[PDB]
Design a protein around this ligand. Sequence first.
Ligand code: HEM
Ligand SMILES: C[As](C)(=O)[O-]
Ligand SMILES: C[As](C)(=O)[O-]
Ligand SMILES: [Ca+2]
Ligand SMILES: [Ca+2]
Ligand SMILES: [Fe+3]
Ligand SMILES: [Fe+3]
Ligand SMILES: [Fe+3]
Ligand SMILES: [Zn+2]
Ligand SMILES: [Zn+2]
Ligand SMILES: [Zn+2]
Ligand SMILES: [Zn+2]
Ligand SMILES: [Zn+2]
Ligand SMILES: [Zn+2]
Ligand SMILES: [Zn+2]
Length: 319
Amino acid sequence: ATCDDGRTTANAACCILFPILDDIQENLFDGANCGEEVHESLRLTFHDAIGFSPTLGGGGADGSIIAFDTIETNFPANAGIDEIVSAQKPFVAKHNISAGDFIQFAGAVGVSNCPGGVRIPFFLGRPDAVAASPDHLVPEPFDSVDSILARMGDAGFSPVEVVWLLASHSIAAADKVDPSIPGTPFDSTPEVFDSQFFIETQLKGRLFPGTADNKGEAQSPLQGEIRLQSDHLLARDPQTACEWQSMVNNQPKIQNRFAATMSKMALLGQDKTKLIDCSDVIPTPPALVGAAHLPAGFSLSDVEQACAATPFPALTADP
Ligand code: HEM
Ligand SMILES: C[As](C)(=O)[O-]
Ligand SMILES: C[As](C)(=O)[O-]
Ligand SMILES: [Ca+2]
Ligand SMILES: [Ca+2]
Ligand SMILES: [Fe+3]
Ligand SMILES: [Fe+3]
Ligand SMILES: [Fe+3]
Ligand SMILES: [Zn+2]
Ligand SMILES: [Zn+2]
Ligand SMILES: [Zn+2]
Ligand SMILES: [Zn+2]
Ligand SMILES: [Zn+2]
Ligand SMILES: [Zn+2]
Ligand SMILES: [Zn+2]
């Protein structure tokens, strides 16, 4: 199909997305960059979708975190998310798509701006949210591995799928974990969707980049970086350590698993056979330019190898 302006897409119904794409690319993403708003919007896709529990309720990827923001944004685990919700609200008001669709669309658009990134499958047609998420559904950085795997499992994700989804932390920072140093990234390349995150989480911790007693924070190996206690544990726990290490310098796996699992998350609470596939409106992501590697002055002796079956891979070091 050919839309009013000459752009094409497989299903004509997808045409309404093109002006929305242009609007968000300039006005939310600072001109199609992989920056702060991309990161927050990708976080938002998760804090929307994971509000889903067979026992407790919540409609999943339904736009509830916008529609019921007054409730959801005051949950402790949602600290800091009010900023991006308030930034997305005017676009949702202005355009003719549901908040659930908008959140997933903005997340997939944003991720496509990141070198090494992926086009997450996107489906159009979610109805407006009809309930707030229950509290206590979003994993927290001071939660155990057992707790996180049980929560994500409750929502339908296996342990390997949790690791795959945490490739998100390759383009991410924290603002509230240590509010003395807001905006500190989880890897040395927060504007590149790469395996740096899985390498750097495996390094021996050395320092706290800000203050030293924050709940849910572990030592970081690098002054410009913050480490979550949840990521420290997942990189090391016998349940997840071997999958974690398998991501290192495995960019094809990161891409293919992240996109597939994000699609599954984007569809929590929904039914893709009632939705329309609009994946071809999402832009083509830029490529990686070079290999993930150790930071300057590090070596493999700085890696806390945690997988019994398989030696951590050789890596070069930024010299
Ligand atoms: C599995 C358990 C997870 C835990 C415990 C966790 C925890 C956290 C924490 C504490 C922050 C920083 C919040 C702040 O202080 O500003 C954060 C940021 C973020 N998370 Fe995770 N998260 C998890 C899974 C996920 C998943 C599945 C996604 C997939 C979309 C995701 C995407 C992000 C992004 C992109 C950021 C950066 C936000 C920003 O830069 O402002 N997270 N997460
Ligand atoms: C039950 As919980 C994910 O708030 O520790
Ligand atoms: C004290 As809790 C179950 O919200 O991690
Ligand atoms: Ca929701
Ligand atoms: Ca990165
Ligand atoms: Fe509201
Ligand atoms: Fe913030
Ligand atoms: Fe580097
Ligand atoms: Zn900006
Ligand atoms: Zn922000
Ligand atoms: Zn519009
Ligand atoms: Zn809780
Ligand atoms: Zn908790
Ligand atoms: Zn942020
Ligand atoms: Zn364990």
